[PDB]
């Protein structure tokens with residue numbers, strides 16, 4: 053880990069003295085869900101590039117910003133554009149923001165991402181609540197906590213079985229009723245794989261048999277660092293595609309389609325998140 | 335990744351100006367299958383050590399060469415001796431040749447390797463066509479594409495479900511009939527593990543339950559880089575041994591036996607490959 | 617690997633000329649099992665920090681020592697405090713001692729660790745003999761042998777299916793009868809995960825379905841290096857907790873509880889080990 057405790061502190065303090073805003077809820081917008089930034093009011097934007105110690109983006113979409121503001125009654129901070137392991141970032145960089153949020157005073161982290169559906173029942177457009185995750189990179193060593201533990205943040209061996217807030221998932225199921233939507237609010241296990249290439253059929257079968265419902269290339273690292281911090285954690289996946297499970301099918305998962313789905317069910321996710329803010333304690 | 339786009343270009347151009355040969359098909363010979371180099375005509379040999387930017391071998395068998403020539407009607411380029419992750423090479427070195435081949439004008443990659451049989455039906459000497467693969471190292475982060483994507487080679491999120499050419503696998507099943515062999519041409523899923531040590535019984539059971547048919551310590555990285563490039567891909571495994579699946583058995587998988595099998599079914603593989611060249615488009 | 621063959625030699629020779637002791641059996645004490653050091657006689661202690669080339673501890677418990685002596689008729693060497701991958705150590709450091717032991721003249725390695733129980737039959741306090749292991753980090757590349765192989769230690773592709781000594785496991789089952797204990801001596805498969813955070817429910821389910829009986833964050837690397845060396849290997853896990861397998865349960869795995877169990881069944885393990893020494897050849 054290239055960051056000392058001081059680096060996290062210096063970054064937090066810089067931010068605190070450059071905005072009057074004091075966030076409680078941190079929101080990490082996944083792929084094609086950065087729209088949420090438009091719904092904040094009293095919005096103050098910061099480019100990642102101007103924030104000391106922040107991972108400087110390579111050349112994905114060149115858009116990397118921290119937006120502070122209010123979202124339906126909650127003092128928020130949103131990450132529009134997140135860091136991925138597949139881009140070459142070591143996990144201690146990918147999750148660097150999460151620890152900054154904590155020192156800013158945040159106590160809740162909402163994570164969203166786009167993911168392939170592994171559960172045969174899921175459909176494009178569906179929203180899946182995350183009850184649990186399978187951290188494959190973590191089993192092998194790619195765990196954001198690897199390295200000396202800093203007592204100031206958390207314990208050496210933090211538990212994850214209770215990572216996804218029970219209370220918030222229920223209130224999420226509740227709130228969805230108010231939406232009175234056509235489809236139900238899905239719920240299941242999220243499995244992380246490093247990517248950046250998509251799964252083969254054999255690989256999809258594996259992920260299925262392991263009990264995963266959706267597959268993505270992010271999130272788990274941030275969740276683990278959050279929990280290690282004491283942050284409350286809630287999140288969901290936008291099923292942008294149904295991974296191929298048979299060899300007969302003549303279709304391929306492509307970024308084009310993912311973004312497309314990200315465009316359709318776009319504001320559908322944003323609403324849910326904005327409303328759910330009221331369901332978050334203080 | 336220590337290689338810039340320029341490095342790949344400089345290597346390709348050096349090769350292009352040092353041989354009149356212009357390959358279409360690149361062939362990566364696995365363990366004990368380097369014999370194929372003898373069947374090329376108008377053969378021109380290059381030691382890896384003389385090629386700019388090529389990974390310089392440590393001390394496996396000290397034989398590392400690029401052989402250009404013609405194989406049964408096709409302008410080829412063969413790798414006699416390939417790079418492995420278990421030797422300490424980062425995947426961007428292991429797969430460095432594949433991207434060079436692409437800039438040389440190659441459009442097809444044939445990969446062969448030796449592997450343990452996981453499917454109880456397979457037998458030593460058997461040849462298994464590869465219909466799909468399970469990339470375990472990739473799930474955790476060891477994917478040759480990790481790092482910034484260069485648009486010039488391919489897309490950020492390339493698909494792999496259609497990695498192994500459907501057309502060529504059928505023509506391979508076809509051609510094998512002409513061989514009129516005793517045993518049938520096997521076909522299945524290849525699972526990659528990093529090695530260099532062999533699987534325990536419990537591990538073999540795992541690989542079996544994941545749906546793999548053969549286990550090896552290579553290939554998948556080259557395949558992914560090829561596909562990312564647009565290369566057509568065909569390949570197979572020589573089942574040099576039946577991995578131990580029970581604790582009662584009193585035998586151990588050893589390099590001696592693998593090489594031995596590599597010696598027996600030696601020319602049997604070479605023929606198939608040489609003939610199959612005619613089955614490859616242009 | 618940052619160590620040349622010379623480094624291992626220099627460390628062994630330094631040790632040999634700083635103690636008259638000449639160990640035959642090396643014992644690696646897991647978490648809360650370092651008590652075994654008290655049972656050695658003619659004991660000579662060495663802090664890891666004073667041993668050339670030894671990984672210098674960060675700040676776990678600040679206790680890192682090599683204790684030479686005699687344990688019930690056997691010339692031993694014990695590691696009180698072992699190195700873990702989750703602390704940031706590359707596997708070639710974690711396993712550096714094992715190769716030193718070999719050059720000191722050791723021919724047997726006994727490994728103990730604390731682990732969560734995955735098999736529903738196991739109970740806290742139980743002792744599980746290790747018949748086999750599933751090396752998940754190894755499948756992805758985190759194998760202590762990665763890098764050039766040194767013929768002087770072992771072969772390039774060492775087998776592991778026979779890693780856990782058949783003879784010693786039987787004599788262990790035998791000896792346990794003499795204990796005439798309430799509970800039986802358990803036996804099963806150990807799965808290694810990198811940690812340092814604990815498994816989620818979904819992850820526990822995975823490990824279960826893979827056929828593991830106990831999960832830990834160590835051991836496998838040392839075992840592989842031992843075997844590669846020719847060392848006889850015997851070991852066991854102290855089931856300090858039953859991993860959560862359902863979402864209803866309202867309990868969390870914590871270091872507190874692990875240490876607690878380490879304190880209870882403490883001397884129960886020590887005895888077994890001390891007695892078992894007599895069961896070890898010469």
Ligand SMILES: O=c1[nH]cnc2c([C@@H]3N[C@H](CO)[C@@H](O)[C@H]3O)c[nH]c12
Nearest residue numbers: 166167168267268269270295307310
């Ligand atoms: O089927 C899938 N497999 C793996 N990742 C994704 C994704 C997510 N979307 C992104 C690529 O569009 C990538 O960052 C990944 O996290 C969507 N569908 C899938």
Ligand SMILES: O=c1[nH]cnc2c([C@@H]3N[C@H](CO)[C@@H](O)[C@H]3O)c[nH]c12
Nearest residue numbers: 448449450549550551552577589592
């Ligand atoms: O049972 C097996 N498990 C894993 N790899 C191999 C191999 C391949 N052969 C090589 C070792 O002889 C090694 O490079 C690996 O890629 C043969 N049999 C097996």
Ligand SMILES: O=c1[nH]cnc2c([C@@H]3N[C@H](CO)[C@@H](O)[C@H]3O)c[nH]c12
Nearest residue numbers: 730731732831832833834859871874
């Ligand atoms: O349930 C478990 N999962 C993973 N590791 C452990 C351990 C072992 N104990 C240590 C943490 O107390 C850690 O080093 C790990 O190796 C006990 N219980 C479990």
